[PDB]
Amino acid sequence: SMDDDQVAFSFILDNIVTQKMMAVPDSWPFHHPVNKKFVPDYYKVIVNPMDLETIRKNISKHKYQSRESFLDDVNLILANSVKYNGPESQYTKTAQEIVNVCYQTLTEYDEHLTQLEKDICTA
Amino acid sequence: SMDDDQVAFSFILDNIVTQKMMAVPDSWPFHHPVNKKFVPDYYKVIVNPMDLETIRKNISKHKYQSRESFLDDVNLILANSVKYNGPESQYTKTAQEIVNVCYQTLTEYDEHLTQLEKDICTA
Structure with a gap:
């Protein structure tokens, strides 16, 4: 966590979220946890909610040490x-575009x- | 088919399936229709089954004239x-890697x- 390699890794992930994923058109409903006020049954239907703010908070706490766990949470947004x-x-198509810009940017940075x-890992 | 544009289009889609999608680790359960011997309630739960072999058979018969209809069948695997x-x-995560690498390769071949x-279309 105090390791600059971990901080640099988290920094790159954070920028995939803010520069690419949150820039998807009409993506705001995925930027934060679903608001039960507007979607009253959401947490009765979806057992493990996920959203981009929660992922960013995980990033800020250096909870991702490799890209697989980060991509797993991103993919969960779409599956949910x-x-x-x-x-x-239409919401699912937007979520898939969020996944696509994430996945393809991860490929570019492989x-x-x-x-x-x-x-x-070495540290 | 004798239309070379259609044949070339189908050929490219076929290679997305065999070179990328079927190369996903542990993806074999998605390569063919679900075998009810092992998953006995599958066809009681899922009304429109889909798998990569069925998509390849559709490609061989030139069912897809554009990416949209192809993606509709690919996404149906994930929906199921x-x-x-x-x-x-874990199976849904595998399906999402199949879908994600499909979108990424289509973008590469755009x-x-x-x-x-x-x-x-002109023809």
């Missing part, structure tokens, strides 16, 4: 939207992220 | 796994696929 909104919902992941 | 296995299931789609 398939369950709640439906597989063909060699950089691999080095950081190794240096986090 | 969210419903049957749950949003957090310039080829857009031209082919237009040349199929």
